[PDB]
Amino acid sequence: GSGNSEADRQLLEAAKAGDVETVKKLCTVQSVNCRDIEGRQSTPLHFAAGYNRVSVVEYLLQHGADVHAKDKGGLVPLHNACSYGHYEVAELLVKHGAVVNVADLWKFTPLHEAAAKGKYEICKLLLQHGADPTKKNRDGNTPLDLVKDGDTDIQDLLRGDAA
Amino acid sequence: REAGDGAE
Ligand SMILES: *CCCn1cc(CCCCCc2cn(CCC*)nn2)nn1
Ligand SMILES: [Cl-]
């Protein structure tokens, strides 16, 4: 493709920063799904999801952002929200249609990310929306295989034993 | 496997 303009770079920054007023000014049908070419090809939505910019996420979803957009590793925004623990964001994405069992290039799901990163409430959320805890990544590992021993709440959750 | 963008 033809790359980014300065205005596109300004939009990616505003999305990561939570500068919602700037995002409103810069987001066009042509820019809303631009990619961060010099990073890992994150879209505005990837950034806003990863950095917990809930107002930005809301705006982007309402103005044509692609919930399914893949970064260089095949991560979709829901992966980013789950990795970094951002529950409201994850819920928003799921409400708009995010695929809860989506796999990146390494067959990691959002539940693998949440498990590995010790995010109990995210794991519970994903489970409440149909996440399959038996899915194996390219290493043969389930989400449970990625849970630290100190996260016994998550271990119980994924075994079937949580309140 | 490289990290997605974000913080938390
Ligand atoms: C795939 C992970 C890449 N990664 C993470 C680290 C640990 C250092 C990261 C810096 C921590 C950081 C980021 N922010 C922004 C606010 C969430 N603040 N501190 N190394 N490699
Ligand atoms: Cl925000």
Side-chain angles (χ1 to χ4, degrees), chain A residues 1-71 73-106 108-163, chain B residues 1-7:
Chain A
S2 52
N4 287 336
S5 68
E6 196 86 329
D8 295 325
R9 288 186 281 274
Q10 292 162 12
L11 174 61
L12 291 159
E13 164 59 12
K16 83 189 66 165
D19 179 0
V20 70
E21 295 304 329
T22 300
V23 169
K24 294 182 176 189
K25 290 164 171 278
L26 299 175
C27 175
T28 64
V29 305
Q30 164 172 215
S31 71
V32 62
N33 297 130
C34 67
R35 302 192 157 274
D36 185 34
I37 275 160
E38 301 89 0
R40 56 177 294 107
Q41 315 310 306
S42 291
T43 66
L45 185 65
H46 290 268
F47 277 118
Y51 282 88
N52 202 21
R53 311 302 191 191
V54 178
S55 296
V56 174
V57 173
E58 289 168 337
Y59 187 82
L60 287 175
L61 291 173
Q62 289 155 16
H63 302 270
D66 184 6
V67 166
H68 316 288
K70 287 173 200 306
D71 74 4
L75 297 185
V76 294
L78 181 61
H79 289 276
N80 301 251
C82 295
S83 291
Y84 300 106
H86 303 320
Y87 184 104
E88 188 173 2
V89 170
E91 196 174 40
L92 283 161
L93 296 168
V94 171
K95 296 298 195 190
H96 201 277
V99 174
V100 167
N101 285 307
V102 62
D104 81 353
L105 288 178
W106 289 58
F108 279 62
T109 65
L111 186 59
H112 290 269
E113 283 274 25
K117 300 286 227 64
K119 306 300 182 191
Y120 172 87
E121 291 301 335
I122 307 300
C123 292
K124 183 172 160 193
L125 175 68
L126 289 169
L127 298 159
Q128 291 169 332
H129 293 76
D132 183 351
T134 75
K135 289 189 73 88
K136 297 175 266 184
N137 67 16
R138 195 188 284 177
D139 304 311
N141 284 332
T142 61
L144 185 58
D145 291 318
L146 306 190
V147 177
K148 285 15 146 221
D149 287 330
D151 289 319
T152 55
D153 57 347
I154 299 177
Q155 291 190 165
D156 284 349
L157 174 65
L158 298 165
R159 282 294 187 204
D161 298 341
Chain B
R1 196 176 162 263
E2 305 173 295
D5 279 300

mmCIF file of all heavy atoms in Angstrom, chain A residues 15 17-20 52-57, ligand 2:
data_model
loop_
_atom_site.group_PDB
_atom_site.id
_atom_site.type_symbol
_atom_site.label_atom_id
_atom_site.label_comp_id
_atom_site.label_asym_id
_atom_site.label_seq_id
_atom_site.Cartn_x
_atom_site.Cartn_y
_atom_site.Cartn_z
ATOM 1 N N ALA A 15 -4.928 7.826 19.501
ATOM 2 C CA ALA A 15 -5.624 6.604 19.935
ATOM 3 C C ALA A 15 -4.841 5.977 21.037
ATOM 4 O O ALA A 15 -5.465 5.572 22.022
ATOM 5 C CB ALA A 15 -5.817 5.653 18.778
ATOM 6 N N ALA A 17 -2.817 7.401 23.117
ATOM 7 C CA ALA A 17 -2.804 8.353 24.228
ATOM 8 C C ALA A 17 -4.129 8.606 24.908
ATOM 9 O O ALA A 17 -4.164 9.247 25.964
ATOM 10 C CB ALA A 17 -2.196 9.684 23.727
ATOM 11 N N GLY A 18 -5.238 8.233 24.280
ATOM 12 C CA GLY A 18 -6.552 8.508 24.774
ATOM 13 C C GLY A 18 -6.991 9.917 24.480
ATOM 14 O O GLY A 18 -7.810 10.453 25.271
ATOM 15 N N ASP A 19 -6.444 10.538 23.471
ATOM 16 C CA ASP A 19 -6.815 11.947 23.102
ATOM 17 C C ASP A 19 -8.049 11.855 22.187
ATOM 18 O O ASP A 19 -7.950 11.915 20.938
ATOM 19 C CB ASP A 19 -5.675 12.657 22.432
ATOM 20 C CG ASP A 19 -6.030 14.063 22.022
ATOM 21 O OD1 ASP A 19 -7.213 14.555 22.241
ATOM 22 O OD2 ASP A 19 -5.121 14.640 21.451
ATOM 23 N N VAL A 20 -9.222 11.632 22.796
ATOM 24 C CA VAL A 20 -10.464 11.354 22.071
ATOM 25 C C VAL A 20 -10.895 12.509 21.167
ATOM 26 O O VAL A 20 -11.321 12.245 20.081
ATOM 27 C CB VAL A 20 -11.565 10.728 22.948
ATOM 28 C CG1 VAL A 20 -12.101 11.691 23.928
ATOM 29 C CG2 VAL A 20 -12.619 10.055 22.096
ATOM 30 N N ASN A 52 -6.113 0.802 27.082
ATOM 31 C CA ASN A 52 -7.259 1.014 27.947
ATOM 32 C C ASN A 52 -7.923 2.414 27.681
ATOM 33 O O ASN A 52 -8.424 3.099 28.650
ATOM 34 C CB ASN A 52 -6.951 0.947 29.430
ATOM 35 C CG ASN A 52 -8.212 0.638 30.229
ATOM 36 O OD1 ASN A 52 -9.208 0.107 29.697
ATOM 37 N ND2 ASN A 52 -8.156 0.962 31.516
ATOM 38 N N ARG A 53 -7.990 2.775 26.425
ATOM 39 C CA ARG A 53 -8.576 4.083 26.076
ATOM 40 C C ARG A 53 -10.000 3.918 25.727
ATOM 41 O O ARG A 53 -10.392 3.866 24.556
ATOM 42 C CB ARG A 53 -7.754 4.784 24.956
ATOM 43 C CG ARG A 53 -6.260 4.805 25.257
ATOM 44 C CD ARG A 53 -5.947 5.479 26.525
ATOM 45 N NE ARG A 53 -4.554 5.712 26.649
ATOM 46 C CZ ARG A 53 -3.939 6.097 27.724
ATOM 47 N NH1 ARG A 53 -4.618 6.415 28.812
ATOM 48 N NH2 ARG A 53 -2.618 6.319 27.719
ATOM 49 N N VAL A 54 -10.817 3.735 26.767
ATOM 50 C CA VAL A 54 -12.188 3.245 26.567
ATOM 51 C C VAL A 54 -13.027 4.201 25.723
ATOM 52 O O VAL A 54 -13.754 3.781 24.882
ATOM 53 C CB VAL A 54 -12.877 3.015 27.935
ATOM 54 C CG1 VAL A 54 -14.296 2.567 27.764
ATOM 55 C CG2 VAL A 54 -12.115 1.991 28.754
ATOM 56 N N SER A 55 -12.889 5.526 25.959
ATOM 57 C CA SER A 55 -13.627 6.467 25.142
ATOM 58 C C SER A 55 -13.275 6.402 23.682
ATOM 59 O O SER A 55 -14.142 6.493 22.807
ATOM 60 C CB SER A 55 -13.460 7.882 25.657
ATOM 61 O OG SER A 55 -14.028 7.994 26.953
ATOM 62 N N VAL A 56 -11.975 6.252 23.439
ATOM 63 C CA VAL A 56 -11.462 6.057 22.068
ATOM 64 C C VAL A 56 -12.029 4.767 21.441
ATOM 65 O O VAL A 56 -12.491 4.781 20.311
ATOM 66 C CB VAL A 56 -9.959 6.096 21.995
ATOM 67 C CG1 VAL A 56 -9.515 5.753 20.625
ATOM 68 C CG2 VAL A 56 -9.417 7.477 22.416
ATOM 69 N N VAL A 57 -12.008 3.680 22.212
ATOM 70 C CA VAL A 57 -12.588 2.417 21.706
ATOM 71 C C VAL A 57 -14.039 2.596 21.319
ATOM 72 O O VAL A 57 -14.419 2.178 20.224
ATOM 73 C CB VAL A 57 -12.401 1.285 22.743
ATOM 74 C CG1 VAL A 57 -13.165 0.014 22.270
ATOM 75 C CG2 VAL A 57 -10.913 0.959 22.901
HETATM 76 CL CL CL C 2 -9.969 7.173 26.167
#
